[PDB]
Design an enzyme around this catalytic site. Structure first.
Site, PDB file in Angstrom:
ATOM      1  N   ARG A   1       0.764  -1.132   0.087  1.00 32.36           N
ATOM      2  CA  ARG A   1      -0.147   0.072  -0.136  1.00 32.36           C
ATOM      3  C   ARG A   1       0.956   1.168   0.090  1.00 32.36           C
ATOM      4  O   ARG A   1       1.641   1.459   0.943  1.00 32.36           O
ATOM      5  CB  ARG A   1      -0.772   0.097   1.015  1.00 32.36           C
ATOM      6  CG  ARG A   1      -1.955   1.035   1.106  1.00 32.36           C
ATOM      7  CD  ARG A   1      -2.952   0.893   2.331  1.00 32.36           C
ATOM      8  NE  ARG A   1      -3.946   2.114   2.488  1.00 32.36           N
ATOM      9  CZ  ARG A   1      -4.863   2.112   3.479  1.00 32.36           C
ATOM     10  NH1 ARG A   1      -4.738   1.338   4.456  1.00 32.36           N
ATOM     11  NH2 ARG A   1      -5.616   3.111   3.224  1.00 32.36           N
TER      12      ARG A   1
ATOM     13  N   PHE B   1       0.891  10.393   2.017  1.00 31.55           N
ATOM     14  CA  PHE B   1       0.306   9.991   3.305  1.00 31.55           C
ATOM     15  C   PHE B   1       1.139   9.031   4.041  1.00 31.55           C
ATOM     16  O   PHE B   1       1.615   9.266   5.045  1.00 31.55           O
ATOM     17  CB  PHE B   1      -0.981   9.362   3.212  1.00 31.55           C
ATOM     18  CG  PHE B   1      -1.634   8.903   4.464  1.00 31.55           C
ATOM     19  CD1 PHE B   1      -2.040   9.693   5.417  1.00 31.55           C
ATOM     20  CD2 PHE B   1      -2.046   7.541   4.536  1.00 31.55           C
ATOM     21  CE1 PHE B   1      -2.457   9.329   6.601  1.00 31.55           C
ATOM     22  CE2 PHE B   1      -2.317   6.907   5.553  1.00 31.55           C
ATOM     23  CZ  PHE B   1      -2.737   7.991   6.697  1.00 31.55           C
TER      24      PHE B   1
ATOM     25  N   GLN C   1       2.991   1.766   3.240  1.00 30.92           N
ATOM     26  CA  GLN C   1       2.698   0.600   3.892  1.00 30.92           C
ATOM     27  C   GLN C   1       3.667  -0.690   3.227  1.00 30.92           C
ATOM     28  O   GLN C   1       3.543  -0.717   2.121  1.00 30.92           O
ATOM     29  CB  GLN C   1       1.374   0.209   3.960  1.00 30.92           C
ATOM     30  CG  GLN C   1       1.151  -0.857   5.148  1.00 30.92           C
ATOM     31  CD  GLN C   1      -0.290  -1.229   5.435  1.00 30.92           C
ATOM     32  OE1 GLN C   1      -1.159  -0.749   4.616  1.00 30.92           O
ATOM     33  NE2 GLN C   1      -0.497  -2.049   6.550  1.00 30.92           N
TER      34      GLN C   1
ATOM     35  N   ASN D   1      -1.827  -1.263  11.866  1.00 28.00           N
ATOM     36  CA  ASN D   1      -2.973  -1.794  13.078  1.00 28.00           C
ATOM     37  C   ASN D   1      -4.012  -2.574  12.243  1.00 28.00           C
ATOM     38  O   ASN D   1      -4.143  -2.676  10.936  1.00 28.00           O
ATOM     39  CB  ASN D   1      -3.334  -0.635  13.758  1.00 28.00           C
ATOM     40  CG  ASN D   1      -3.634  -0.826  14.999  1.00 28.00           C
ATOM     41  OD1 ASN D   1      -3.753   0.241  16.031  1.00 28.00           O
ATOM     42  ND2 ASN D   1      -3.511  -1.918  15.600  1.00 28.00           N
TER      43      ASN D   1
ATOM     44  N   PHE E   1       4.903   1.001   8.203  1.00 28.23           N
ATOM     45  CA  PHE E   1       4.839   2.220   7.359  1.00 28.23           C
ATOM     46  C   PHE E   1       5.518   3.390   7.792  1.00 28.23           C
ATOM     47  O   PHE E   1       5.460   3.877   8.765  1.00 28.23           O
ATOM     48  CB  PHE E   1       3.348   2.409   7.324  1.00 28.23           C
ATOM     49  CG  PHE E   1       2.560   2.845   8.570  1.00 28.23           C
ATOM     50  CD1 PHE E   1       2.033   2.172   9.251  1.00 28.23           C
ATOM     51  CD2 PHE E   1       2.304   4.346   8.487  1.00 28.23           C
ATOM     52  CE1 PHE E   1       1.495   2.574  10.669  1.00 28.23           C
ATOM     53  CE2 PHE E   1       1.590   4.700   9.621  1.00 28.23           C
ATOM     54  CZ  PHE E   1       1.297   3.762  10.645  1.00 28.23           C
TER      55      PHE E   1
ATOM     56  N   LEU F   1      -3.176   9.509  13.200  1.00 29.78           N
ATOM     57  CA  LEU F   1      -2.411   8.399  13.327  1.00 29.78           C
ATOM     58  C   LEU F   1      -1.890   8.449  14.707  1.00 29.78           C
ATOM     59  O   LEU F   1      -2.127   7.491  15.637  1.00 29.78           O
ATOM     60  CB  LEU F   1      -1.017   8.620  12.408  1.00 29.78           C
ATOM     61  CG  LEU F   1      -0.992   7.951  11.191  1.00 29.78           C
ATOM     62  CD1 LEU F   1      -0.912   6.599  11.179  1.00 29.78           C
ATOM     63  CD2 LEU F   1      -1.926   8.499  10.163  1.00 29.78           C
TER      64      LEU F   1
ATOM     65  N   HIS G   1      -2.089   5.032  16.730  1.00 29.80           N
ATOM     66  CA  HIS G   1      -0.925   4.228  16.142  1.00 29.80           C
ATOM     67  C   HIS G   1       0.456   4.213  16.951  1.00 29.80           C
ATOM     68  O   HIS G   1       0.542   5.296  17.485  1.00 29.80           O
ATOM     69  CB  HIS G   1      -0.698   4.651  14.721  1.00 29.80           C
ATOM     70  CG  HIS G   1      -1.916   4.141  13.905  1.00 29.80           C
ATOM     71  ND1 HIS G   1      -1.910   2.810  13.242  1.00 29.80           N
ATOM     72  CD2 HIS G   1      -2.951   4.880  13.518  1.00 29.80           C
ATOM     73  CE1 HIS G   1      -3.308   2.654  12.443  1.00 29.80           C
ATOM     74  NE2 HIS G   1      -3.836   3.881  12.661  1.00 29.80           N
TER      75      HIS G   1
END
Ligand SMILES: [Zn+2]
Ligand SMILES: [Zn+2]
Ligand SMILES: [Zn+2]
Lengths: 159, 50, 303, 317, 55, 290, 195, 76
Positions: A48, A53, A56, A95, A106, A115, A119
């Site tokens: 990803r 942003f 990942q 997560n 990531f 986040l 996270h």
């Protein structure tokens, strides 16, 4: 039960070196260092990749739902009251919900509030933000999946 | 005025193709239009000397 | 294994209420709203060879014997049809009910007996040689699901009175009542050992009841959740694996539900049906599943 | 010397058939080697006995120059096209036209039969190809996207099912199902007037006056480039033994290896007696089903028939 | 798509001959020629046919 | 070209208050009110006293402008197109003159039918950047007075001989001396001089909004409605987004918090983000200048 | 332990402990509305200048835009399994898919040739389940989905075609131009240019 | 934990652990209510149902007569 410094990634686009914080969250650091040591990331991809942003990465299935750990499929978070998501380079733990961590990291690209709302900040990159930026500038599709392969080749638990 | 086409010329751009865009931001810059000067201007003056 | 996993089967024309695997596991019978009974292969290319008419109603419940010889069909024109597995003839038609026959079940290993339940409140016993009802049990309410024990001594019956009732054939009295469902029971299935019996009900709880001579007296053994019942009010059926290890139940949210019998964990939630599902069934030798739904189609999942 | 080519024996003329009253613009061989068709500028299709070289039948009905002729392998049919704008279907059982395929706007230059579906694909000067159902005489699709006239077409059963070169110097590899272009190959500088498909190796070549180019089928990958034969080439044909034949408007014809692309023979044949020195030219060539004769359709209104020389090696570069 | 029936035959022949000559002169010129001059060659073809009919 | 796609693209105030709908599909029933090419007309009845609404525009002319096929309002917000293009940019410039319109329609139809069939082909990237004033006047619950049978024109002449049986409303039509009465189809569709959208923009302009830092370089923020239930440790956790935060004076007696930032740009950005939007700990935090 | 600039970041990576708004390269909060299509890079190759070649194409389209498409491949020695026609059964499967796809379009074309012979029949009244993607419920009434029964409107046999179809418009733009891939170009002389 | 998140039409039978494991990572904030919903054509997801005619029209007339009906949504 040892504490290595920075972890050497060797991606297709270049070499990113990850400075992992052992004071604030040592348990994820021992997990990720052990997985890089065993040879778990050799040939897996950045599944990803979102523009501005994060990126990942780390999935032997390469799907974004798979992965496990040295503890087994899950373990609790390390939501530290000092670590905050601001700026590119910050390495983190992916997560699924409350305190469920597999083997997916990531690298963040932008300052984010939701986040560090929910996270775990693993660490940061130290050597190689240009390769991170070149990975960020790769073509994607509807569900933010690269058209080509942006895969990691090798990994080293150095230091 | 009784005709199908023909009023499409001054109203807008006739069969408009937008220029294909890319790799350089071309949204800020714009061109400065023609000075009218409607007190010297001639039909001969626009088309130029044949 | 056979062919390639999936093997979608079409040919039906309306809703498909029921389906059963042959006792050897080499052919298949499907039935539903079509007023037709189809006999198809499980191997090769799974192609039709026999079509069986002989109804003026919806073929509600379908079953087999343990030999693979006699085909029993419970239809929605107050009659039950008895056929042969090969050659396709109407062997014995039995008419005793005054309303719609919801379910039938053959007593296995005993002398030939069939028990049926209908919407008039009746649970009736049938010997195939006699052309007459043997015993008749007026409950008082509509009866949806009916099966035997292995000993051919009890009738285990589910109705709309939220209470599974077990009738003794010798005393002809209401032996057991099983409470624990909050809405109408739509499907019962007795296991290959006779120890356990599986039940669907409209309250969306799939229940396992141990039928034994010696009881804990509160027989709420295992509880399954996830099964969906809705406004369609279909008769939902459940099935046991051949080794009793897996459990299938039809659902009205188009997902094929298969649980593990020991961990009470959803093994399989197979998609692929446009319409709500009526009956999911296991192949007797191999882990192959026929699933039958209201989208007029059949599915062969190979595990 | 990077490759060493296969040794191919030289080809030599042995028969000059005569009798058309116009340029012979097309040729095709029947599947059983009993006869071959020609179509010509004198608006007749002539069936010739392949073994004896004798005029078997003369069919009339085109109003203008016959440009392409093909024989069906599945059905007992004969398809032809002309500058008439017309695409005809001849029932060889009756020697009569039974079906005409209507819809092209200008002269139809080529046609090929799909080998397995009963679909006919034609090219025209109106910058389009068309896809016809043989049984219902209907345009299934109109392959549009070229900007000049469309010279040639080939069909397959495997992927890209339709391949065409044209006079706007490009080649389009198409999708038969969707009806849209899949690959555009712009490599040629002048008009692609010939494409040819290989029988086994899943490649194709194409020709133009600059040079001839070989290519892998799925996405048109460049494999090779075969040069030296510099004239307006009209046809390309392949022998299963890997012999490419490239014939041109100057009457010259060069015989090539497929694999390495080695020019082993140049045949600059002489014209007919009455003919003119500027009238030497080849429009069509075909191998027979035995792949040991070479039928050329010439601009001096003749057919020339070639065979391999039985006087072995005098050759090798 | 109008058909070439009987009153269109000669006009269509001259329409197609001229297109064939257009294709051949586009392919005959070498690589760096100015890609004009088609009309002039077509005029020469017309003149050569009139001199052919005129002997 | 024809349109011919199954199952129209509809909002929820026109698709009805019943979850069970019976609609009819006519293959090439009407011509589009904009495109003027024929499309697939779907006809359904929302509820009980409704009007049998039908789709007015093509699938294509709704994919161009991300609207419902019968109310011609945005699928996401439920607003006129002039309001949404006011709270966005206007770079579509669909032609209105005849031959240009059919030419643009042909080319955009080829563009859409050379793609997936899921996204608002031009409006997508600009539809990412959103949540302007349009969200603060987006309609919350459906206006089911739209789905409502027209005024009985025989009852206007006092001659409705159906009486109690007539399915058309017996109530007043609107006074034509009203800007809210003219409303052409194309005026509602291109986003040009739509009086409903004019009134929505006049309301959203007089919506309470930021004021500039009247005196130079002052980054001081005057927070009223702070509240005594919240903590200042969470304030910095919300406020380190903007930049180099300077001192934060806290007065919990007047429920006023004073904030200083590095540059006045950061204070203006904070004014943008914070004013009349920000609710933290479920309690509204009001910020002012001075 | 001092951010303050993009200099102190040696090779980048913003420190997640400083509690300021540091950012290594310029990932600015107000990156203005630029219509420039973003510079994308392939896995380990160059900047894709291909993106200004595939404007109106999709991501599966194979266009050729580089010098390395003009380089001749090798002689590819013998009967190699690289250059092989796919498979006989795969070809038969492509044939079957193709003929079934073609026959449907054939039937839709041929339906004009006899428009009314046994004039048509239409009642497969069907159901469709639809999820409004609008949820936030005041909308269905409180539901997440809605079921719709579609009946097709019954066509009048005796009714002529409804709308003018003869309207005629000029040809639209062709698909985006392909790169031309020619050779370097032979040099031309004054002598041959004049001859 | 084993299968692609969305392709469609799997040729083998998956497990409940290999099809309904959640998607990891944070959701991207660069999508709206329409863009985050699993939609099929611009306004939502539309799939063919096979509900019995009588029960459908029963609940339809139940809502049209009184103002309530059972829920036809399949999870909710
Ligand atoms: Zn429209
Ligand atoms: Zn609407
Ligand atoms: Zn009235």
């Amino acid at each position: 039960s040892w504490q290595p410094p920075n972890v050497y990634l060797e991606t297709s686009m270049g070499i990113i070196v990850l400075e992992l914080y052992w004071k604030h969250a040592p348990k994820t650091c021992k997990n990720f260092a052990e997985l890089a040591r065993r040879g778990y990331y050799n040939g897996t991809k950045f599944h990803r990749i979102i523009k501005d942003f994060m990126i990942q990465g780390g999935d032997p299935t390469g799907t974004g739902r798979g992965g496990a750990s040295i503890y087994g499929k899950q373990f609790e978070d390390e939501l530290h009251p000092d670590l905050k998501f601001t700026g590119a380079g910050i390495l983190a733990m992916a997560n699924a919900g409350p305190d469920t961590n597999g083997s997916q990291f990531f690298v963040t690209l932008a300052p984010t509030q939701w986040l560090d709302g929910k996270h775990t900040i693993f660490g940061r990159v130290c050597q190689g933000i240009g390769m991170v930026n070149r990975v960020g500038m790769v073509e994607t599709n509807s569900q933010d999946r690269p058209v080509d392969d942006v895969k990691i080749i090798k990994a080293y638990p150095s230091g | 005025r009784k005709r199908k086409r023909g009023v499409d010329y001054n109203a807008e751009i006739p069969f408009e193709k937008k220029p294909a865009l890319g790799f350089y931001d071309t949204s800020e810059e714009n061109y400065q239009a023609l000075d009218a000067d409607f007190r010297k201007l001639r039909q001969q003056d626009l088309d130029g000397e044949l | 294994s056979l062919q390639a996993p999936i093997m979608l089967l079409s040919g039906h024309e309306g809703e498909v209420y029921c389906c059963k695997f042959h006792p050897n596991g080499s052919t298949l019978a499907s039935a539903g709203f079509d007023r037709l009974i189809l006999l198809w292969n499980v191997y090769g290319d799974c192609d039709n060879y026999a079509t069986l008419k002989g109804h003026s109603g919806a073929v509600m419940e379908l079953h087999y014997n343990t030999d693979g010889s006699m085909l029993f069909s419970a239809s929605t024109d107050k009659t039950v049809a008895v056929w042969d597995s090969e050659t396709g003839e109407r062997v014995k038609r039995l008419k005793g009910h005054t309303s719609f026959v919801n379910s039938c079940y053959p007593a296995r290993r005993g002398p030939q007996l069939v028990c049926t339940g209908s919407d008039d409140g009746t649970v009736k016993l049938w010997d195939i040689r006699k052309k007459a009802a043997i015993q008749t049990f007026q409950n008082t309410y509509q009866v949806l699901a009916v099966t035997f024990n292995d000993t051919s001594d009890q009738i285990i019956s589910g109705g709309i009175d939220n209470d599974i009732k077990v009738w003794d054939l010798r005393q002809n009295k209401l032996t057991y009542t099983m409470r624990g469902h909050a809405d109408s029971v739509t499907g019962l299935s007795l296991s290959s050992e006779g120890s356990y019996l599986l039940s669907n009900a409209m309250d969306n709880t799939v229940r396992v009841w141990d039928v034994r001579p010696f009881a804990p007296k509160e027989r709420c053994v295992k509880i399954f959740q996830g099964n969906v019942h809705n406004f369609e009010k279909n008769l939902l059926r459940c099935s046991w694996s051949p080794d009793g290890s897996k459990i299938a139940a039809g659902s009205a949210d188009r997902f094929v539900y298969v649980w593990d019998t020991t961990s009470r964990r959803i093994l399989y939630k197979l998609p692929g049906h446009a319409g709500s599902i009526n009956e999911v069934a296991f192949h007797p030798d191999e882990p192959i599943i026929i699933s039958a739904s209201s989208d007029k189609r059949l599915y062969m999942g190979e595990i | 010397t990077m490759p060493k080519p296969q040794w191919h024996p030289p080809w030599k003329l042995y028969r000059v058939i005569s009798g058309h009253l116009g340029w012979v613009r097309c040729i095709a061989v029947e599947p059983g080697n009993q006869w071959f068709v020609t179509g010509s500028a004198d608006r007749t299709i002539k069936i010739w006995d392949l073994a004896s070289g004798k005029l078997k039948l003369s069919l009339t009905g085109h109003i203008s120059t016959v440009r392409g002729v093909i024989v069906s392998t599945r059905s007992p049919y004969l398809f032809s096209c002309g500058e008439d704008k017309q695409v005809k279907c001849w029932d060889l059982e009756y020697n009569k036209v039974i079906r005409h395929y209507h819809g092209h706007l200008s002269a139809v230059y080529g046609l090929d039969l799909h080998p397995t579906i009963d679909v006919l694909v034609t090219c025209s000067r109106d910058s389009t190809a068309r896809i016809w159902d043989v049984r219902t005489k209907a345009s299934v699709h109109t392959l549009s996207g070229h900007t000049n006239a469309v010279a040639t077409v080939r069909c397959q059963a495997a992927e890209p099912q339709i391949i065409t070169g044209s006079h706007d110097t490009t080649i389009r590899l198409w999708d038969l199902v969707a009806g849209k272009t899949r690959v555009t190959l712009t490599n040629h500088k002048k008009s692609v007037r010939a494409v040819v498909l290989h029988p086994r190796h899943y490649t194709f070549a194409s020709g133009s006056p600059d040079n001839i180019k070989q290519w892998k089928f799925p996405d048109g990958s460049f494999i090779q480039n075969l040069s030296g034969h510099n004239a307006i080439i009209n046809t390309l044909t392949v022998n299963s033994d890997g012999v490419l034949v490239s014939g041109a408007d100057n009457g010259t014809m060069h015989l090539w290896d497929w694999r390495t692309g080695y020019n082993f023979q140049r045949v600059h044949a002489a014209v007919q007696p009455g003919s003119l020195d500027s009238e030497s030219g080849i429009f069509a060539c075909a191998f027979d089903q035995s792949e040991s004769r070479l039928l050329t359709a010439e601009a001096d209104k003749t057919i020339k028939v070639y065979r391999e020389d039985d006087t072995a090696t005098e050759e090798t570069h | 798509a109008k058909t070439v029936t009987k009153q269109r035959v000669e006009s269509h022949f001259d329409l197609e001959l001229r297109a064939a000559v257009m294709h051949d002169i586009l392919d005959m010129m070498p690589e760096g020629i100015k890609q004009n001059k088609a009309r002039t060659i077509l005029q020469h073809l017309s003149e050569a046919w009139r001199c052919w009919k005129a002997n | 070209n024809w349109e011919d796609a199954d199952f129209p693209i509809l909002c929820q105030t026109c698709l009805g208050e019943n979850p069970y709908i019976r609609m009819t599909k006519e293959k090439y029933g009407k011509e589009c009110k904009i495109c003027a090419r024929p499309f697939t007309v779907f006809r359904w009845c929302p509820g009980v006293r409704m009007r049998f609404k039908k789709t007015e525009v093509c699938q294509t002319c709704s994919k161009l402008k991300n609207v419902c096929q019968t109310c011609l309002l945005d699928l996401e917000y439920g607003l006129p197109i002039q309001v949404r293009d006011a709270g966005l940019s206007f770079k579509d410039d669909m032609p209105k003159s005849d031959v240009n319109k059919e030419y643009y329609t042909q080319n955009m139809e080829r563009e859409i039918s050379n793609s997936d069939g899921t996204r608002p082909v031009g409006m997508l990237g600009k539809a990412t950047s959103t949540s302007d004033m349009l969200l603060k006047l987006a309609r919350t619950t459906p206006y089911y007075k739209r789905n409502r049978p027209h005024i009985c024109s025989f009852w206007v002449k006092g001659e409705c001989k159906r009486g109690e049986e007539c399915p058309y409303r017996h109530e007043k039509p609107t006074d034509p001396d009203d800007p809210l009465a003219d409303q052409n189809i194309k005026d509602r569709y291109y986003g040009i001089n739509d009086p409903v959208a004019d009134k929505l923009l006049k309301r959203a302009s007089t919506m309470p909004r930021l004021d500039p830092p009247e005196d130079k370089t002052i980054t001081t923020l005057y927070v009223g409605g702070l509240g005594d239930t919240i903590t200042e440790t969470d304030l910095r956790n919300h406020f380190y987004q903007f930049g180099e935060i300077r001192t934060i004076t806290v007065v919990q007696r007047q429920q006023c918090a004073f904030i200083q930032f590095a540059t006045r740009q950061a204070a203006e950005v904070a004014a943008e983000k914070s004013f009349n939007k920000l609710i933290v700990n479920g309690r509204r935090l009001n910020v002012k200048w001075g | 332990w001092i951010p303050r600039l993009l200099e102190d970041f040696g090779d980048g990576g913003a420190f997640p402990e400083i509690h300021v708004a540091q950012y290594p390269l310029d990932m600015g909060r107000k990156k203005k509305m630029s219509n420039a299509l973003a510079i994308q890079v392939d896995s380990e190759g160059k900047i894709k200048y291909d993106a200004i070649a595939r404007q109106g194409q999709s991501k599966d389209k194979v266009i050729y835009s580089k010098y390395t498409d003009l380089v001749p491949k090798e002689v590819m020695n013998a009967d190699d399994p690289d250059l092989q026609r796919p498979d006989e059964e795969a070809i038969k499967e492509i044939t079957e898919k193709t003929r079934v796809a073609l026959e449907k379009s054939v039937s839709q074309k041929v339906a004009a040739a006899m428009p009314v012979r046994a004039a048509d029949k239409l009642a497969p009244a069907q159901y469709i389940r639809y999820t409004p993607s609008q949820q936030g419920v005041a909308f269905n009434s409180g539901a997440k989905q809605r079921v719709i029964r579609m009946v097709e409107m019954q066509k009048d046999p005796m009714e002529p075609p409804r709308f003018k179809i003869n309207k005629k418009i000029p040809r639209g733009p062709p698909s985006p131009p392909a790169p031309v891939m020619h050779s370097p170009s032979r040099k031309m002389t004054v002598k041959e240019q004049q001859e | 934990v084993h299968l692609d998140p969305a392709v469609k039409e799997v040729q083998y039978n998956p497990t409940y652990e290999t099809m309904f494991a959640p998607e990891f990572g944070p959701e991207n904030p660069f999508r709206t209510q329409q863009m985050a919903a699993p939609r099929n054509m611009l306004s939502g997801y539309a799939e063919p149902a096979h509900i019995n005619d009588f029960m459908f029209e029963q609940q339809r007339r139940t809502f049209a007569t009184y103002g309530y009906a059972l829920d036809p949504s399949l999870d909710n």
